[PDB]
Structure 1
Amino acid sequence: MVNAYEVLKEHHVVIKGLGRKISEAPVNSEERHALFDELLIELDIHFRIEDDLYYPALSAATKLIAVAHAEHRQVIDQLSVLLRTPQSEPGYEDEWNSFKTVLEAHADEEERDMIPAPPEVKITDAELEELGEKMAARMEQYRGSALYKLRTKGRAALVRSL
């Protein structure tokens, strides 16, 4: 029996783990480039399940919902800056660290304020299980479409979809 909080917390662990593997791989290595694509896939589907399923269930917390969505903008805006410095360029590792910091702050801020749901949100244990089930299935569906984009249309197309 999984629930919505566990789905998101377990996926934050995945994302943080990819971020650590990226950081540990040599700059501009084949390994680091593949790991970064893997992170983009997981990030794409993570923000979508938050925006499409989890945050709507929490809509009664209007101020924290606004902050949550603005924090997504923070991550996407920083990703745009990161992609303007390729790994072959001297300032790349500074840009990667700046992005990693913003990404890690997403999860930390969410796990402070929004997991579990804020007090204004009335959601039952049974509803959290059904929501967790829907999120887990939607994650598989979204990963399929994210991969389709990356495979058939490229990394740029996957970034434009965030």
Structure 2
Amino acid sequence: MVNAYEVLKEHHVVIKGLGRKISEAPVNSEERHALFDELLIELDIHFRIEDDLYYPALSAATKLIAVAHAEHRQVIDQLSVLLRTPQSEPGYEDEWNSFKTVLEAHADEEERDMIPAPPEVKITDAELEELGEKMAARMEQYRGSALYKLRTKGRAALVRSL
């Protein structure tokens, strides 16, 4: 059995790894475009399992939940700025690094304040395992719908869904 913390920490590693691979790929390369779409899919499902399963289980930490949702808005708002600059434009790399910075600020705040659960939250190891199992399954479901959205409706429709 996997628990809720391990699900989130291992998925953070995935997201961070995609961030690094994107940064390392040539600007406007075919490889960087595909990696960026992959990151959007993983970001979508990360925020969704947080909003839909993890934070409700941690709802006793009301101030930190508010902060976490506000951090989500930070990432989404910066993503909108990033998507206004095509990778071929001179200031793109600056914009990517600004986005990557906001992304890393989300992940840091979560790892500082929300994993493990704040002390307000009474949660047992068994409750964390059940939650982890639900989150792993729901993340798979969400990746399927995000993939489907990207494939059938395009990148803009994936972004509008964040």
TM superposition score normalised by structure 2: 0.99
Inter-partner Cα distance in structure 1 for 2:5 and 2:147 = 25
Q: CA RMSD in A?
A: 0.4
SS at match of 1:115: coil
Inter-partner Cα distance in structure 2 for 1:59 and 1:90 = 44
Inter-partner Cα distance in structure 1 for 2:104 and 2:134 = 25
**1:69-112 deviations in whole A, cap 9, x for unaligned?**
00000000000000000100000000000000110111111010
Structure 2 residue 23 is matched with structure 1 residue 23: yes
Structure 2 residue 116 is matched with structure 1 residue 116: yes
Inter-partner Cα distance in structure 1 for 2:74 and 2:136 = 25
Q: CA deviation at 1:148?
A: 0.5
- In the other structure, the counterpart of 2:84 is 84
Inter-partner Cα distance in structure 2 for 1:135 and 1:73 = 21
Inter-partner Cα distance in structure 2 for 1:101 and 1:13 = 16
| Deviation >3 Å, runs of 4+ | none
Inter-partner Cα distance in structure 2 for 1:110 and 1:151 = 30
Inter-partner Cα distance in structure 2 for 1:108 and 1:145 = 27
Inter-partner Cα distance in structure 1 for 2:115 and 2:16 = 17
Identity of aligned residues (%): 100
Unaligned runs of 5+ in 2: none
Unaligned runs of 5+ in 1: none
